[PDB]
Amino acid sequence: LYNVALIKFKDIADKYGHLTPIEGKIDIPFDIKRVYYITKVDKDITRGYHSHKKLHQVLICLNGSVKIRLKIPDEEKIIELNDPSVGLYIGPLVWREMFDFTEGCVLLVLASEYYDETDYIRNYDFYIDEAKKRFL
Amino acid sequence: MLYNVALIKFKDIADKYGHLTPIEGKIDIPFDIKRVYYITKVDKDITRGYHSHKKLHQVLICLNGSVKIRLKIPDEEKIIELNDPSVGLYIGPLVWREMFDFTEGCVLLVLASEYYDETDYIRNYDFYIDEAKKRFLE
Ligand SMILES: C[C@H](O)COCC(COC[C@@H](C)O)(COC[C@@H](C)O)COC[C@@H](C)O
Ligand SMILES: Cc1cn([C@H]2C[C@H](O)[C@@H](CO)O2)c(=O)[nH]c1=O
Ligand SMILES: Cc1cn([C@H]2C[C@H](O)[C@@H](CO)O2)c(=O)[nH]c1=O
């Protein structure tokens, strides 16, 4: 619900294939300080299990499909990403888990800050405690 | 002999949850990321690219499948196959490139040191060669 959006990118498609460009501050609202990507995840696996207080991210499935379970206090949605020209914006204090990674799935993440363990919330009870103060 | 190009190795975090590779600007690569783009769904018989730049620095990474990058400067050519998501191909100024043999499911990611500037996109092969001969020819 809150703090999440689907963002639509340009998709230049012709006989040479498809290309999507993303420029920091233009196609997404922040500068891209860091990217990471997740591949070769087994079909029965669920990963993620984290939130953040300060980071903004955009998640994009560049091949195959993956399901993202987004939680905030009292609220939960599952969004399937399967189109490289669509990004899932996730702002602060949303908890996420990802599952149903397909064969050959590639999940790319663009992030608004360098990695900072102090801002990675990995303990769900701590999450709930911080998040109910924001959302409730 | 092949100037202005390198293979860069990234961290590959592999565990029961799969693989993850992180790339932070100025740390894992030598520039800040102003732009990314990615290429998907390329037919197996296609060659694309055919360009160079004067000022742009890029890293190419094949996140799934395999793709061949033909790099050239005057008098020199190499073809590099990218097929590992934890390896990037850095390409500096005045290297001409083409990409081909994209496999089914291939995904090529490019990280770029500047926003798109048509004026730095050298598409004329004869102009490329002229400019590049001034740089590389002794
Ligand atoms: C079946 C079992 O493996 C599920 O693990 C639940 C769990 C979900 O965490 C956040 C949840 C969405 O609220 C454990 O949480 C229970 C109490 C402790 O918060 C996931 O376990 C965390 C591992 C997988 O890193
Ligand atoms: C590579 C790239 C191309 N383009 C446009 C300009 C090129 O003339 C066109 C190629 O079809 O795509 C962008 O708008 N942004 C980009 O990052
Ligand atoms: C998401 C991400 C994780 N990691 C690593 C660091 C943490 O110690 C590890 C989780 O144990 O994930 C990075 O190094 N960079 C990143 O961008």
Short mmCIF file of C-alpha atoms and ligand atoms in Angstrom, two decimals:
data_model
loop_
_atom_site.label_atom_id
_atom_site.label_comp_id
_atom_site.label_asym_id
_atom_site.label_seq_id
_atom_site.Cartn_x
_atom_site.Cartn_y
_atom_site.Cartn_z
CA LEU A 1 0.00 0.00 0.00
CA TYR A 2 1.91 3.10 1.20
CA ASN A 3 5.44 3.82 0.00
CA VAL A 4 5.20 1.71 -3.13
CA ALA A 5 4.61 2.45 -6.84
CA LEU A 6 4.92 0.85 -10.23
CA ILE A 7 7.03 2.99 -12.50
CA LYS A 8 6.87 2.68 -16.27
CA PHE A 9 10.04 2.90 -18.34
CA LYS A 10 10.68 3.57 -22.02
CA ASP A 11 10.98 0.33 -24.05
CA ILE A 12 12.68 0.80 -27.37
CA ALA A 13 11.72 -2.22 -29.41
CA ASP A 14 12.68 -2.83 -33.03
CA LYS A 15 14.27 -5.63 -35.01
CA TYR A 16 17.48 -5.32 -32.91
CA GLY A 17 15.53 -6.38 -29.79
CA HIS A 18 14.43 -4.39 -26.74
CA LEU A 19 16.29 -1.75 -24.72
CA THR A 20 15.18 0.13 -21.59
CA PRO A 21 17.12 3.10 -20.26
CA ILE A 22 16.90 4.48 -16.73
CA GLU A 23 18.66 7.72 -15.84
CA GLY A 24 19.04 8.72 -12.25
CA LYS A 25 16.72 11.51 -11.12
CA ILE A 26 14.84 11.39 -14.44
CA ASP A 27 13.31 7.99 -14.92
CA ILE A 28 13.41 7.35 -11.18
CA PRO A 29 13.33 9.93 -8.45
CA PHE A 30 16.81 9.32 -7.04
CA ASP A 31 20.46 9.02 -8.06
CA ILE A 32 21.64 5.43 -8.47
CA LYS A 33 24.49 5.00 -5.91
CA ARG A 34 24.36 1.21 -5.96
CA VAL A 35 22.84 -1.60 -8.03
CA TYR A 36 22.68 -5.30 -7.25
CA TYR A 37 21.16 -8.25 -8.98
CA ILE A 38 19.85 -11.65 -7.95
CA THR A 39 20.05 -14.74 -10.20
CA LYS A 40 19.93 -18.57 -9.99
CA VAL A 41 17.42 -18.70 -7.16
CA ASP A 42 15.80 -22.14 -6.65
CA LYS A 43 12.03 -22.37 -7.24
CA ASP A 44 11.07 -23.27 -3.69
CA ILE A 45 13.14 -20.42 -2.13
CA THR A 46 11.91 -17.25 -0.39
CA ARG A 47 14.44 -14.49 0.24
CA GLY A 48 14.68 -10.91 1.33
CA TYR A 49 13.16 -10.59 4.77
CA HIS A 50 14.21 -6.98 5.38
CA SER A 51 13.22 -3.37 5.38
CA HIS A 52 15.06 -0.04 5.68
CA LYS A 53 14.51 3.34 7.32
CA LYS A 54 16.16 5.59 4.82
CA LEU A 55 16.75 3.75 1.51
CA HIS A 56 14.75 4.10 -1.68
CA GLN A 57 14.88 1.29 -4.17
CA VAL A 58 13.45 0.22 -7.53
CA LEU A 59 13.10 -3.49 -8.36
CA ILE A 60 12.94 -4.74 -11.90
CA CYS A 61 12.56 -8.22 -13.28
CA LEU A 62 14.66 -8.37 -16.46
CA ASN A 63 13.96 -12.04 -17.32
CA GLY A 64 11.37 -14.54 -16.21
CA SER A 65 9.13 -13.75 -13.26
CA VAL A 66 9.35 -13.24 -9.49
CA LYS A 67 6.78 -12.42 -6.83
CA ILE A 68 7.34 -9.73 -4.28
CA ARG A 69 5.36 -9.78 -1.03
CA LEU A 70 5.21 -6.32 0.41
CA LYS A 71 4.20 -5.86 4.01
CA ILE A 72 3.44 -2.94 6.24
CA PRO A 73 1.49 -3.05 9.54
CA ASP A 74 -1.95 -4.54 8.90
CA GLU A 75 -1.35 -4.81 5.16
CA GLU A 76 0.13 -7.21 2.61
CA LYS A 77 0.25 -7.37 -1.21
CA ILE A 78 1.91 -9.67 -3.67
CA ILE A 79 3.10 -8.14 -6.97
CA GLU A 80 4.43 -10.26 -9.76
CA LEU A 81 7.11 -8.65 -11.82
CA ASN A 82 7.57 -10.05 -15.25
CA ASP A 83 8.21 -7.10 -17.53
CA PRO A 84 11.58 -5.39 -17.85
CA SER A 85 9.97 -2.03 -18.65
CA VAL A 86 8.21 -1.83 -15.29
CA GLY A 87 9.91 -1.00 -11.96
CA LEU A 88 8.60 -1.46 -8.45
CA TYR A 89 9.49 1.52 -6.33
CA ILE A 90 9.84 0.76 -2.63
CA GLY A 91 10.36 3.49 -0.13
CA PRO A 92 11.21 3.40 3.55
CA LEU A 93 9.74 1.02 6.12
CA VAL A 94 8.21 -1.47 3.76
CA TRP A 95 9.09 -5.10 4.60
CA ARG A 96 9.67 -7.35 1.62
CA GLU A 97 10.11 -11.03 0.77
CA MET A 98 10.58 -12.46 -2.67
CA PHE A 99 9.58 -15.88 -3.99
CA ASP A 100 8.60 -17.91 -6.99
CA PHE A 101 11.71 -16.99 -8.87
CA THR A 102 11.48 -18.66 -12.24
CA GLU A 103 14.11 -20.53 -14.21
CA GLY A 104 16.50 -17.89 -15.54
CA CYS A 105 14.92 -15.10 -13.46
CA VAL A 106 17.01 -11.93 -13.08
CA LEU A 107 15.99 -9.32 -10.45
CA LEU A 108 17.85 -6.03 -10.66
CA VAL A 109 17.71 -3.52 -7.83
CA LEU A 110 18.64 0.18 -8.08
CA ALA A 111 19.29 1.85 -4.72
CA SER A 112 19.51 5.44 -3.53
CA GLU A 113 22.42 5.01 -1.09
CA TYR A 114 25.56 2.93 -0.53
CA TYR A 115 25.14 -0.16 1.61
CA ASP A 116 24.80 0.71 5.30
CA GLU A 117 24.13 -2.20 7.66
CA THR A 118 22.88 0.25 10.26
CA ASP A 119 19.87 0.99 8.03
CA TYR A 120 19.06 -2.66 7.12
CA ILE A 121 16.28 -3.90 9.40
CA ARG A 122 16.47 -7.73 9.44
CA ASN A 123 14.51 -8.45 12.62
CA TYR A 124 10.78 -8.50 11.98
CA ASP A 125 9.92 -7.56 15.57
CA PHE A 126 12.10 -4.45 15.30
CA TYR A 127 10.44 -3.69 11.96
CA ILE A 128 6.96 -3.95 13.35
CA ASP A 129 7.91 -1.77 16.28
CA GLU A 130 9.35 1.01 14.04
CA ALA A 131 6.67 0.70 11.33
CA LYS A 132 3.58 0.86 13.53
CA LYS A 133 4.80 4.27 14.70
CA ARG A 134 4.82 5.48 11.03
CA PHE A 135 1.75 3.79 9.58
CA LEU A 136 -0.55 3.56 12.60
CA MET B 1 47.33 -3.99 -27.44
CA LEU B 2 43.60 -3.76 -26.71
CA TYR B 3 43.58 -0.44 -24.87
CA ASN B 4 40.77 1.10 -22.82
CA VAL B 5 39.12 -2.19 -21.91
CA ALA B 6 39.13 -4.48 -18.86
CA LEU B 7 37.41 -7.33 -17.20
CA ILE B 8 36.25 -6.44 -13.77
CA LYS B 9 35.34 -9.01 -11.16
CA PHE B 10 32.51 -8.42 -8.75
CA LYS B 11 31.52 -10.13 -5.50
CA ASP B 12 29.18 -13.12 -6.06
CA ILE B 13 27.26 -13.84 -2.84
CA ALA B 14 26.17 -17.44 -3.33
CA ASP B 15 24.29 -19.36 -0.68
CA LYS B 16 21.11 -21.41 -0.46
CA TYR B 17 19.11 -18.28 -1.31
CA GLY B 18 20.77 -17.97 -4.75
CA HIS B 19 23.35 -15.52 -6.08
CA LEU B 20 23.61 -11.78 -5.57
CA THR B 21 26.13 -9.38 -7.02
CA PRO B 22 26.36 -5.79 -5.71
CA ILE B 23 27.99 -2.89 -7.61
CA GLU B 24 28.52 0.44 -5.83
CA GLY B 25 29.60 3.51 -7.84
CA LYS B 26 33.23 4.49 -7.38
CA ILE B 27 33.90 1.33 -5.32
CA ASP B 28 33.26 -1.74 -7.47
CA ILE B 29 33.61 0.35 -10.65
CA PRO B 30 35.65 3.47 -11.05
CA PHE B 31 32.78 5.94 -11.85
CA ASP B 32 29.38 7.03 -10.46
CA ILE B 33 26.41 5.46 -12.18
CA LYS B 34 24.40 8.24 -13.87
CA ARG B 35 22.54 5.84 -16.13
CA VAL B 36 21.75 2.17 -16.67
CA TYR B 37 20.20 0.40 -19.56
CA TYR B 38 19.53 -3.15 -20.46
CA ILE B 39 18.98 -5.22 -23.62
CA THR B 40 16.64 -8.19 -23.78
CA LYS B 41 14.78 -10.33 -26.32
CA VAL B 42 17.45 -10.09 -29.06
CA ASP B 43 17.01 -12.50 -31.95
CA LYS B 44 19.78 -15.04 -32.30
CA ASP B 45 20.91 -13.71 -35.70
CA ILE B 46 21.19 -10.09 -34.70
CA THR B 47 24.23 -7.87 -34.32
CA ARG B 48 23.69 -4.55 -32.62
CA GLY B 49 25.80 -1.70 -31.27
CA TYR B 50 28.04 -0.27 -34.01
CA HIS B 51 29.21 2.77 -32.04
CA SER B 52 31.80 4.37 -29.86
CA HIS B 53 32.14 7.41 -27.55
CA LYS B 54 34.64 10.10 -26.77
CA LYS B 55 33.91 10.77 -23.08
CA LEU B 56 31.64 8.00 -21.75
CA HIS B 57 32.84 5.10 -19.56
CA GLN B 58 30.67 1.99 -19.38
CA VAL B 59 30.60 -1.46 -17.88
CA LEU B 60 28.74 -4.23 -19.64
CA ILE B 61 27.44 -7.29 -17.77
CA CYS B 62 25.55 -10.34 -19.01
CA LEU B 63 23.10 -11.22 -16.23
CA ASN B 64 21.66 -14.32 -17.91
CA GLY B 65 22.73 -16.43 -20.87
CA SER B 66 25.60 -15.35 -23.06
CA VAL B 67 26.49 -12.63 -25.57
CA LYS B 68 29.58 -11.78 -27.58
CA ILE B 69 31.10 -8.35 -27.64
CA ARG B 70 33.28 -7.42 -30.59
CA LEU B 71 35.67 -4.69 -29.51
CA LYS B 72 37.85 -2.83 -31.90
CA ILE B 73 40.27 0.00 -32.25
CA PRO B 74 42.50 0.64 -35.22
CA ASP B 75 44.44 -2.46 -36.20
CA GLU B 76 43.07 -4.47 -33.30
CA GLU B 77 40.01 -6.54 -32.62
CA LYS B 78 38.91 -8.95 -29.90
CA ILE B 79 35.80 -10.74 -29.19
CA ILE B 80 34.85 -11.31 -25.57
CA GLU B 81 32.07 -13.63 -24.46
CA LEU B 82 30.14 -12.51 -21.44
CA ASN B 83 28.33 -15.24 -19.57
CA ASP B 84 28.99 -14.67 -15.92
CA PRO B 85 26.92 -12.13 -13.97
CA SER B 86 29.89 -11.44 -11.60
CA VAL B 87 32.15 -10.22 -14.39
CA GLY B 88 31.87 -6.80 -16.03
CA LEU B 89 33.46 -5.50 -19.22
CA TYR B 90 34.74 -1.99 -18.78
CA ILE B 91 34.95 -0.03 -21.96
CA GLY B 92 36.54 3.35 -22.09
CA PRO B 93 36.63 6.12 -24.72
CA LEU B 94 37.15 5.46 -28.37
CA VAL B 95 36.61 1.79 -28.48
CA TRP B 96 34.16 0.63 -31.19
CA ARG B 97 31.81 -2.12 -30.26
CA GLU B 98 29.25 -4.55 -31.63
CA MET B 99 27.31 -7.23 -29.82
CA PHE B 100 26.09 -10.55 -31.22
CA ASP B 101 25.15 -14.16 -30.51
CA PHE B 102 22.69 -13.19 -27.83
CA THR B 103 21.35 -16.47 -26.45
CA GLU B 104 17.66 -17.11 -25.72
CA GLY B 105 16.84 -15.36 -22.43
CA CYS B 106 20.01 -13.19 -22.58
CA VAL B 107 20.06 -9.98 -20.56
CA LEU B 108 22.86 -7.44 -21.11
CA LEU B 109 23.11 -4.65 -18.48
CA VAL B 110 25.13 -1.52 -19.09
CA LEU B 111 26.22 0.93 -16.40
CA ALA B 112 27.22 4.36 -17.77
CA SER B 113 29.19 7.28 -16.34
CA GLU B 114 27.03 10.00 -17.94
CA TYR B 115 23.53 10.77 -18.99
CA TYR B 116 22.76 10.13 -22.62
CA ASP B 117 24.40 12.69 -24.90
CA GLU B 118 23.78 12.13 -28.63
CA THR B 119 26.79 14.34 -29.33
CA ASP B 120 29.09 11.77 -27.71
CA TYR B 121 27.56 8.82 -29.51
CA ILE B 122 29.92 8.26 -32.45
CA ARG B 123 27.93 6.35 -35.05
CA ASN B 124 29.97 7.14 -38.16
CA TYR B 125 32.57 4.49 -38.59
CA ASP B 126 34.86 6.70 -40.70
CA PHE B 127 34.77 9.48 -38.13
CA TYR B 128 35.39 6.94 -35.38
CA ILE B 129 38.47 5.66 -37.17
CA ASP B 130 39.84 9.10 -37.83
CA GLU B 131 39.47 10.12 -34.17
CA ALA B 132 40.79 6.80 -32.91
CA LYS B 133 43.83 6.81 -35.18
CA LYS B 134 44.88 10.12 -33.61
CA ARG B 135 44.71 8.54 -30.12
CA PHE B 136 46.21 5.11 -30.75
CA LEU B 137 48.54 5.40 -33.75
CA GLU B 138 52.06 6.25 -32.32
C1 LIG C 1 7.77 -21.46 7.85
C2 LIG C 1 8.85 -20.52 8.40
O1 LIG C 1 10.15 -20.81 7.86
C3 LIG C 1 8.47 -19.09 8.07
O2 LIG C 1 9.44 -18.20 8.63
C4 LIG C 1 8.78 -17.10 9.24
C5 LIG C 1 9.78 -15.99 9.43
C6 LIG C 1 9.07 -14.72 8.96
O3 LIG C 1 9.70 -13.50 9.33
C7 LIG C 1 8.87 -12.38 8.93
C8 LIG C 1 7.42 -12.78 8.70
C9 LIG C 1 6.86 -12.48 7.33
O4 LIG C 1 6.58 -12.05 9.60
C10 LIG C 1 10.15 -16.08 10.93
O5 LIG C 1 9.54 -15.08 11.76
C11 LIG C 1 8.90 -15.44 12.99
C12 LIG C 1 9.17 -14.43 14.09
C13 LIG C 1 10.46 -14.81 14.76
O6 LIG C 1 9.32 -13.09 13.57
C14 LIG C 1 10.96 -16.21 8.49
O7 LIG C 1 12.12 -16.73 9.13
C15 LIG C 1 13.23 -15.84 8.96
C16 LIG C 1 14.38 -16.53 8.22
C17 LIG C 1 13.88 -17.29 6.99
O8 LIG C 1 15.36 -15.54 7.89
C1 LIG C 2 21.08 3.96 -25.63
C2 LIG C 2 19.96 4.96 -25.55
C3 LIG C 2 19.29 5.26 -26.72
N1 LIG C 2 18.29 6.15 -26.70
C4 LIG C 2 17.59 6.46 -27.95
C5 LIG C 2 18.46 7.35 -28.82
C6 LIG C 2 18.83 6.50 -30.02
O1 LIG C 2 18.87 7.25 -31.23
C7 LIG C 2 17.71 5.48 -30.06
C8 LIG C 2 18.08 4.17 -30.75
O2 LIG C 2 16.86 3.57 -31.19
O3 LIG C 2 17.37 5.26 -28.69
C9 LIG C 2 17.90 6.78 -25.51
O4 LIG C 2 16.97 7.59 -25.53
N2 LIG C 2 18.52 6.52 -24.36
C10 LIG C 2 19.53 5.64 -24.29
O5 LIG C 2 20.10 5.46 -23.18
C1 LIG C 3 22.17 -5.89 -0.69
C2 LIG C 3 23.65 -5.96 -0.40
C3 LIG C 3 24.10 -6.94 0.47
N1 LIG C 3 25.40 -7.00 0.73
C4 LIG C 3 25.90 -8.02 1.65
C5 LIG C 3 26.52 -7.36 2.86
C6 LIG C 3 25.88 -8.08 4.04
O1 LIG C 3 26.86 -8.44 5.01
C7 LIG C 3 25.24 -9.30 3.40
C8 LIG C 3 24.11 -9.90 4.21
O2 LIG C 3 24.72 -10.73 5.20
O3 LIG C 3 24.81 -8.81 2.13
C9 LIG C 3 26.34 -6.12 0.17
O4 LIG C 3 27.55 -6.24 0.45
N2 LIG C 3 25.96 -5.15 -0.65
C10 LIG C 3 24.67 -5.03 -0.97
O5 LIG C 3 24.39 -4.11 -1.75
#
